[PDB]
């Protein structure tokens, strides 16, 4: 228990970091927001700036629209009563259209129409944000890895809410908007499909989800262990290796027989994480479109 480096002993502060310019339209950047001493023990103190932008505003507008559409329905379920709303908050649910409307947009508001409205808002909200992660990347002349990774998350979500429902041929397959209701949907999904422990993609996805926590604890602790040599300066250790990058790899090598490099560790990481939703999205996509029952399928592989 020496100086153990989870919290900083001394904070410092200087003229505000308005940041890199490159091709970034500087009119679109807010100013810097408040400084938090509370964050400063752990991470950076500085809040702000954010880049406003047209896509940004379309995204944020549509996002709230969604959040509000769901919320408006909850008040209608609460009978417009504030105490009821607060009591049954997790029990409220904006469920999709009944099976019979199939894939059509002609459901009544109170019967799956509001769900479709809210979904439309959600859909522009996410995709507009995706285009953002690409553009903010592009303006600074950066690689596209973020938009690339994000796409894997968007894949799972699309399969759940859009692609599978269309392939089942009805919106009733999609996921309702509710805290507990979304959990019941989840359990039910497994039940109604022979148990997802027999879906080989579910267990691959688990392996990677577990593996991301294994990997991040490994990376996080390793960097903290060699930060007495400035190892958390990972880009400078890539271009001009120092003893921190060296002792780091030697730890793993002597421990388990191989090791990574400062750049390649970050390659393991992206894939460890993106594989979660990649294998998971395929898992769910096949369920019911190609396999009604994973145990049964399991019992033949055919």
């Amino acid at each position: 228990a020496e100086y153990q480096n989870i919290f900083s002993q001394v904070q410092v502060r200087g003229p505000a970091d308005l940041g890199m310019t490159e091709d970034v339209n500087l009119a679109n950047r807010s100013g810097v927001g408040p400084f938090s001493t509370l964050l400063g023990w752990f991470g950076n103190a500085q809040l702000g700036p954010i880049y406003l932008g047209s896509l940004g505003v379309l995204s944020l507008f549509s996002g709230l629209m969604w959040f509000f559409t769901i919320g408006i329905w909850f008040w209608y379920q609460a009978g417009w009563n504030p105490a009821v709303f607060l009591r049954d908050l997790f029990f409220f649910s904006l469920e999709p259209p009944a099976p019979e409307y199939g894939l059509s947009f002609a459901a009544p508001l109170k019967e799956g129409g509001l769900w479709l409205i809210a979904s439309f808002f959600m859909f522009v909200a996410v995709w507009s944000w995706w285009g953002r992660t690409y553009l903010r990347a592009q303006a600074l002349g950066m690689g596209k890895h973020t938009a690339w990774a994000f796409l894997s998350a968007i894949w799972l979500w699309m399969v759940l809410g859009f692609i599978r429902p269309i392939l089942m041929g009805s919106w009733s397959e999609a996921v309702p908007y509710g805290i507990f209701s979304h959990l019941d949907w989840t359990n039910n999904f497994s039940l109604v499909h022979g148990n997802l422990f027999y879906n080989p993609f579910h267990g691959l996805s688990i392996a990677f989800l577990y593996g991301s926590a294994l990997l991040f604890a490994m990376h996080g602790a390793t960097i903290l262990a060699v930060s007495r040599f400035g190892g958390e300066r990972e880009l400078e250790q890539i271009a001009d290796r120092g003893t921190a990058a060296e002792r780091a790899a030697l730890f793993w090598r002597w421990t388990m027989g191989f090791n990574a490099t400062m750049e390649g560790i970050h390659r393991w990481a992206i894939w460890m994480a993106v594989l979660v939703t990649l294998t998971g999205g395929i898992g769910i996509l096949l369920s019911g479109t190609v396999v009604d029952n994973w145990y049964v399928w399991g019992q033949n592989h055919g």
């Binding site: 001394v10 200087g14 400078e236 120092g242 990574a260 750049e263 096949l286 399928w297």
Partner: protein, 240 residues
């Protein structure tokens, strides 16, 4: 059937991805070597990858990897045993020699630049206008070594400017010169800075820097190596 086809496909994709991941991770340190520095006979199943080139900013050099490498420094170490696998005793004083836990790397003898081409690290007293903004301010505290003796006093904090964090305490020694101390190896107390790695007579021995106002990458590594090195080699003076 399509499900069975997908799962078998994915496994093939997985063998290939690990293959790529493993090779990407051999861009430094390879080929493997015998204890004597020569190419080892057995290299394993993965080949070195095709070269790639990082171009650094502010015309600070460009890098291609993998490619032949050497330490670029001499290594005061010798064999203790007649076969593979044993330790190599320092032939000198490992502290001065830059070996063991006190190892350092031949990094570029220039300062890390920020995105705007300024020195990333500076003394606070020369960085308009940084200040200790929370926590106990170490400037002015006595520095105690792990023998419970005072080695000097803290005269400044050297700060990472773009990141906005404290990296080194600048310490005045009883002769009037200064050394840099990793922040990440000092304990700031109410009435002192306590440094466990070093005993007070090892401070004069810390590596010194060429200019009062900037630290190079190579200078950094030497200072960091020497200080961490004390954890094992100072140890005789502990002893308390």
């Amino acid at each position: 059937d399509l499900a069975s086809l997908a799962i078998y496909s994915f496994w093939i994709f997985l063998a290939g991805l690990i293959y790529y991941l493993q090779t990407e991770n051999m861009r430094e340190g390879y080929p493997l070597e015998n204890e004597d520095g020569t190419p080892a006979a057995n290299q394993g199943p993965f080949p070195l990858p095709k070269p790639k080139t990082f171009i650094l900013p502010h015309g600070r050099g460009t890098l291609t990897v993998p490619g032949p490498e050497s330490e670029d420094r001499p290594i005061a170490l010798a064999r203790t045993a007649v076969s593979e696998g044993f330790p190599h005793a320092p032939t000198g004083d490992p502290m001065k020699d830059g070996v063991g836990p006190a190892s350092w790397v031949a990094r570029r003898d220039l300062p890390e630049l920020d995105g705007h081409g300024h020195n990333k690290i500076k003394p606070m007293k020369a960085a308009a206008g940084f200040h200790v903004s929370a926590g106990k301010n170490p400037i002015g505290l006595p520095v105690r070594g792990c023998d419970l003796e005072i080695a000097g006093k803290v005269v400044d904090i050297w700060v990472d400017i773009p990141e906005q964090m404290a990296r080194f305490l600048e310490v005045e020694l009883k002769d009037g010169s200064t050394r840099l101390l990793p922040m990440q190896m000092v304990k700031v107390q109410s009435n002192r800075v306590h440094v466990n790695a070093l005993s007070s007579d090892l401070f004069a021995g810390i590596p010194t820097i060429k200019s009062p106002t900037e630290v190079t990458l190579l200078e950094e590594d030497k200072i960091c190596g020497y200080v961490a090195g004390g954890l094992m080699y100072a140890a005789p003076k502990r002893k308390s």
